[PDB]
């Protein structure tokens, strides 16, 4: 997989070509205003060691940080997300998996409208990587969900319990 980050918008300035996970990109550029995803699915992180804001990037050219819904021009770590052949997630109503629950294998642009209940506080990712969004239609803050368990919002890096949409990381093309 390959990605290149540029310090200036419109693919200008100092840049860095990258093919792997990086817990700290500060040594190669101090800001990111544009990116070129040649191949792969990447999760950009605002701070080192995969913390702060998260941004999902699929192959394409991103002229401005706003094209990847960035809150700023900060990108300090990154993950090359693995290809998954299937996707399955269990959504619980209460934290710690308590309460009502639904199971899904498709994308959900609007969670609280689609199911028989509208409080979602814990997740159990069975297969695949997903992007949880704060607002319907894949808008707002983003949180990478990898296979595994998330009992409270604190587990998926969220500073808050807001969720409105969900999508399977798959591929752009």
Q: Please give the Cα distance from 93 to 89 (Å, whole number).
A: 13
Q: What resolution, expressed in A, was reported for this entry?
A: 2.3
Quickly list H helices, the chain: 111-114
Experimental method reported for this structure = X-ray
The class that CATH gives domain 1-83 is mainly beta
The class that CATH gives domain 84-173 is mainly beta
Beta-ladder partners of 89: 104, 125
What is the secondary structure of 29-91 as a DSSP string? -S--SEEEEEESEEEEEEETTTEEEEEEE-SEEESSGGGGT-SSS---EEEEEPP-S--EEEE
CATH 2.60.20.10 residue ranges of the chain are 1-83, 84-173
Q: Please give the Cα distance from 28 to 97 (Å, whole number).
A: 42
């Amino acid at each position: 997989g390959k990605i290149t980050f540029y310090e200036d918008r419109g693919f200008q300035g100092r840049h860095y070509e990258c093919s792997t996970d990086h817990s700290n990109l500060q040594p190669y550029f101090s800001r990111c205003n544009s990116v070129r995803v040649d191949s792969g699915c990447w999760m950009l992180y605002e701070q080192p060691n995969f913390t702060g804001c998260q941004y999902f990037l699929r192959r394409g050219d991103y002229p401005d940080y706003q094209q990847w819904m960035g809150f700023s021009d900060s990108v300090r770590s990154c993950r090359l997300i693995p290809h998954s052949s299937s996707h399955r997630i269990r959504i619980y109503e209460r934290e710690d998996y308590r309460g009502q629950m639904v199971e899904i294998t498709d994308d959900c642009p609007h969670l609280q409208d689609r199911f028989h209940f509208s409080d979602f506080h814990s997740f159990h990712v069975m297969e695949g990587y997903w992007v949880l969004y704060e607002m319907p239609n894949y808008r707002g803050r983003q949180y990478l969900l990898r296979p595994g368990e998330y009992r409270r919002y604190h587990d998926w890096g969220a500073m808050n319990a807001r969720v409105g949409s969900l999508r399977r990381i798959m591929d752009f093309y």
